[PDB]
Amino acid sequence: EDADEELGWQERALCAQTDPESFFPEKGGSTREAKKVCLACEVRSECLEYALQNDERFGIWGGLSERERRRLKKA
Amino acid sequence: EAVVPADAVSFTLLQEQLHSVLDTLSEREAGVVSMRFGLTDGQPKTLDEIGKVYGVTRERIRQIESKTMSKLRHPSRSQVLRDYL
Amino acid sequence: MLIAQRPSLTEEVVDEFRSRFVIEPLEPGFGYTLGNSLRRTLLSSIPGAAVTSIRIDGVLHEFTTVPGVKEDVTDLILNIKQLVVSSEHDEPVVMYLRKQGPGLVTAADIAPPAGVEVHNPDLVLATLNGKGKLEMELTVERGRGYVSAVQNKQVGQEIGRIPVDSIYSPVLKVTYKVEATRVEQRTDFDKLIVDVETKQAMRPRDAMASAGKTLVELFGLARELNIDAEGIDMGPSPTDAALAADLALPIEELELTVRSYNCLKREGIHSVGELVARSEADLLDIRNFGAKSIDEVKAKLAGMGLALKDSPPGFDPTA
Amino acid sequence: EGIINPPIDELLEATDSKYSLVIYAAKRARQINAYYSQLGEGLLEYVGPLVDTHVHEKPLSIALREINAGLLTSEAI
Amino acid sequence: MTAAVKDEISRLPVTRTCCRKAEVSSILRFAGGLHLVSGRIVIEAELDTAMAARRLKRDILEIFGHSSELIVMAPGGLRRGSRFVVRVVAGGDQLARQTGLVDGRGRPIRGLPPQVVSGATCDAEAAWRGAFLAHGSLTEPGRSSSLEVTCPGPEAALALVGAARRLSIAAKAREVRGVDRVVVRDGDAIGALLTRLGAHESVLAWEERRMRREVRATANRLANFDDANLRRSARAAVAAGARVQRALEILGEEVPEHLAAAGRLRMEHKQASLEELGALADPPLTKDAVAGRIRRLLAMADK
DNA sequence: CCAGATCGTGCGACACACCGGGCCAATTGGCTTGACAC
DNA sequence: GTGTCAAGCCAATTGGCCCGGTGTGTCGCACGATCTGG
Numbered sequence A: 001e002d003a004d005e006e007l008g009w010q011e012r013a014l015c016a017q018t019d020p021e022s023f024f025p026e027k028g029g030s031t032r033e034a035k036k037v038c039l040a041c042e043v044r045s046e047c048l049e050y051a052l053q054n055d056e057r058f059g060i061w062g063g064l065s066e067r068e069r070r071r072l073k074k075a
Numbered sequence B: 001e002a003v004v005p006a007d008a009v010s011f012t013l014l015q016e017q018l019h020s021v022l023d024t025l026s027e028r029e030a031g032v033v034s035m036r037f038g039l040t041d042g043q044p045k046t047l048d049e050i051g052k053v054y055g056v057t058r059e060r061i062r063q064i065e066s067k068t069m070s071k072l073r074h075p076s077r078s079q080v081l082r083d084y085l
Numbered sequence C: 001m002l003i004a005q006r007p008s009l010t011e012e013v014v015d016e017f018r019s020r021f022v023i024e025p026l027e028p029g030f031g032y033t034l035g036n037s038l039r040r041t042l043l044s045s046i047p048g049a050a051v052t053s054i055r056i057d058g059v060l061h062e063f064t065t066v067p068g069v070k071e072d073v074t075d076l077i078l079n080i081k082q083l084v085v086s087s088e089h090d091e092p093v094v095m096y097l098r099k100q101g102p103g104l105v106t107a108a109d110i111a112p113p114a115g116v117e118v119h120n121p122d123l124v125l126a127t128l129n130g131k132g133k134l135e136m137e138l139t140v141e142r143g144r145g146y147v148s149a150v151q152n153k154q155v156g157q158e159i160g161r162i163p164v165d166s167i168y169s170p171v172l173k174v175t176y177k178v179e180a181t182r183v184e185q186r187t188d189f190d191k192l193i194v195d196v197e198t199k200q201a202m203r204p205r206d207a208m209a210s211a212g213k214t215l216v217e218l219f220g221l222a223r224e225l226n227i228d229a230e231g232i233d234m235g236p237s238p239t240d241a242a243l244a245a246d247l248a249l250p251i252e253e254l255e256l257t258v259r260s261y262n263c264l265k266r267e268g269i270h271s272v273g274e275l276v277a278r279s280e281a282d283l284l285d286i287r288n289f290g291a292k293s294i295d296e297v298k299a300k301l302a303g304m305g306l307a308l309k310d311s312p313p314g315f316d317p318t319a
Numbered sequence D: 001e002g003i004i005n006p007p008i009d010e011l012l013e014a015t016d017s018k019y020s021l022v023i024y025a026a027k028r029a030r031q032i033n034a035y036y037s038q039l040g041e042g043l044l045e046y047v048g049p050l051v052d053t054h055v056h057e058k059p060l061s062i063a064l065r066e067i068n069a070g071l072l073t074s075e076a077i
Numbered sequence E: 001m002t003a004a005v006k007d008e009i010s011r012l013p014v015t016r017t018c019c020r021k022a023e024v025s026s027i028l029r030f031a032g033g034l035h036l037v038s039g040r041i042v043i044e045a046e047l048d049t050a051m052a053a054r055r056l057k058r059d060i061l062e063i064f065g066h067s068s069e070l071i072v073m074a075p076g077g078l079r080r081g082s083r084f085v086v087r088v089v090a091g092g093d094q095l096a097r098q099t100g101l102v103d104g105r106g107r108p109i110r111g112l113p114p115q116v117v118s119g120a121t122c123d124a125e126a127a128w129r130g131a132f133l134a135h136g137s138l139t140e141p142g143r144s145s146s147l148e149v150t151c152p153g154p155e156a157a158l159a160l161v162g163a164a165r166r167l168s169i170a171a172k173a174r175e176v177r178g179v180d181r182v183v184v185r186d187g188d189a190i191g192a193l194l195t196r197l198g199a200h201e202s203v204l205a206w207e208e209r210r211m212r213r214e215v216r217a218t219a220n221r222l223a224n225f226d227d228a229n230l231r232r233s234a235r236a237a238v239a240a241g242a243r244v245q246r247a248l249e250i251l252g253e254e255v256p257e258h259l260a261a262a263g264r265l266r267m268e269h270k271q272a273s274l275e276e277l278g279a280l281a282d283p284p285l286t287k288d289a290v291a292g293r294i295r296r297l298l299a300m301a302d303k
Numbered sequence F: 001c002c003a004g005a006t007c008g009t010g011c012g013a014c015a016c017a018c019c020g021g022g023c024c025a026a027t028t029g030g031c032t033t034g035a036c037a038c
Numbered sequence G: 001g002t003g004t005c006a007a008g009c010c011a012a013t014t015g016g017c018c019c020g021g022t023g024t025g026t027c028g029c030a031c032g033a034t035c036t037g038g
């Protein structure tokens, strides 16, 4: 369009159009919904890179949970 | 060293937006964040006092703060607050 | 080059015979290139018919008054001048008015010969008092624009002839103006407003069409110098531009009998254009033919009005 | 059309002078603006507009139109 | 059935600007589309409701500043729907950009706009009002009911679920054969939600209906609620018999032997199952024959 | 003509559709306990 | 007394992932009726 400017990859996150509470389950909640949503987001690689760089162990980023991020970070 | 009206109105809008965003969270999470950063009274509090009021461990209180802090810094609730930073 | 914004013409009706046309949005300038041209062509380039001279009676040039009639010579001439007539004879044609007695002599009392007509019989031409008589003759002929009695004075002298000004042009008054109209794009795009007022005979729209045709001919006269010369291309002609939505569509049909669609699909027809034209012979000769199938490819084929054996646009398939 | 609508002569037939008309129209405009601002929240005494409006019309113009049409009355307190 | 509830919802007066913007965005996101033409964009919205088309038209014009068309060509294309298609041509690109459908200088947006999400709870109520107006169905799989709205994608379904959560309600996304929807199975939750949207008369009618009907003890469990469901499919066959009496009002158009016999067996044995009815034929015909015969009887009596 | 498209008819296949009933898994959320830095 | 990290365990979720009745409807197709048309 005529915006001619991009703030970054945040503006192009699919999860913005979806329940923000579904990415932080609670009391035995599931993860299939958010993980399925992430697999269509275009900036998934950028989201995962940002999550790894900031090394936060809460919520799910890039389509992976906290445990998956820990396992990936082990190497 | 005067009050620029644009900056004052911007700060007031930021305060309103922060209160609105913190409302979407649960009561416990919003309360712990408010009493940790002292939004209501401007008096920062230690983790142990927060646990005392909540009757939980200090480390457990530290756990809650991190969860909410990451929740706000997510690519689903950040864009409502990105501009003000 | 491409104009990139095709101007449009819109009419408004003020009275029975008064209109106001708006052309917009014209490129910067171009509100004066074709404003004075339209006004002058309207006012001086449309054929008409009018009275040229009159013969009130055997006695005249007593300008003080014509005996028997209340008014004077000048008022009578003006009333005659207001008359609107239509004629077909190239040569002048003479008609007579023979009202008698007291009363109000009007246009309906005239006795035009064949080939001429008077469009406002209700016009009042004079008033007769004291059992007066008014035996008048009117000569009518065709012309263009406004030509005065000067250029109509006759060297040959006749006792009763009196030449009068002739108003041939159907349009009586034309005015125009231009304004700025663009906000979205850059300003300085011209909007042209022309107010036209004619007489009872002709409507403003016909006058506008005739003037446009005459100007188109006049400027084609110069465009003929080198036909392969680039100009400003309007581009999307409205007629075919609109009809492209249904005439040259690749899809042969959307809703119709499946039997006929299947039969005609694998027989040498893909886009409705290939079928609209040369339909009868193609449907007859080849194995694919139907008696009542015509009803499905003749009447229901006209999505928005169409008959077969019609010339199809876009004969080149955009493969 | 624009800032010359409605005409001042027609408006002055509904009041005593320009000075009173100014305050009359200003008070009505403030009422309309307050009604718009608090329309979503709990109901309040404010009412109007009483005439057809546009997408984003100045409340003062609506107040002047209402005054001209004769849908308002001014008392003395 | 639903039409009355949708009418009550639409006739309701809405005041807060944010709610109106959210409702317009939701309706445009569910039952509307973009039709690229001449390198520009035009917006169409097909609604299967009486006046919600006027509501969307007025809201667009007032809060966004645009002029609509409201062509009443039926949406189904067969002219039977008699439902309204509102179009925006001039400036529709700006409406698309500032309603949330398309933003970020890129493709359209799959789910609900980011602005409707993350807003006051009233904003979520408006989002549900719009979504339930676009599509919807108030089904009764038995005596207790279940709402339904066929969202145009999993992202929209999940967004609606999340918006429901903020209203204290319980919602469940679901998908079948590639088309997905949102279902709230619990009847009490159904009433709770339908109260928020604005409808009350419809809420009262639904509450009285379900309350009176549901209180039919059948020991639950299998073969005790399952027999209750055979009887409920028999009540569905009673509705089919009502369709057969509609066919009788039409006279059935001098039907042949097979369909007449099938209808007679269904009516006389109003509780007998399709298999049981088929077992009653002189030449024993299977459940398939009765199924096809009722299918074709309904097709014939459609008029 | 009479033969395929469309549909009547009919038989079956099969995907649910319950409607509940239950064993186990993910993961994981919450809480604590200890340990290490002030 | 505070502010981090680093494990560790139990528990109610959802959820996977099934058993077990019929039952129903969408398709998936054979025969055949009827119709419209090569």
Ligand code: SF4
Binding pocket: A012, A013, A014, A015, A016, A037, A038, A039, A041, A042, A043, A044, A045, A047, A048, A060, A061, A062, A063, B075
């Ligand atoms: S990958 Fe990141 S940005 Fe994309 S939907 Fe998932 S959490 Fe949002």
Ligand SMILES: [Zn+2]
Binding pocket: E016, E017, E018, E019, E120, E122, E123, E126
């Ligand atoms: Zn709201």
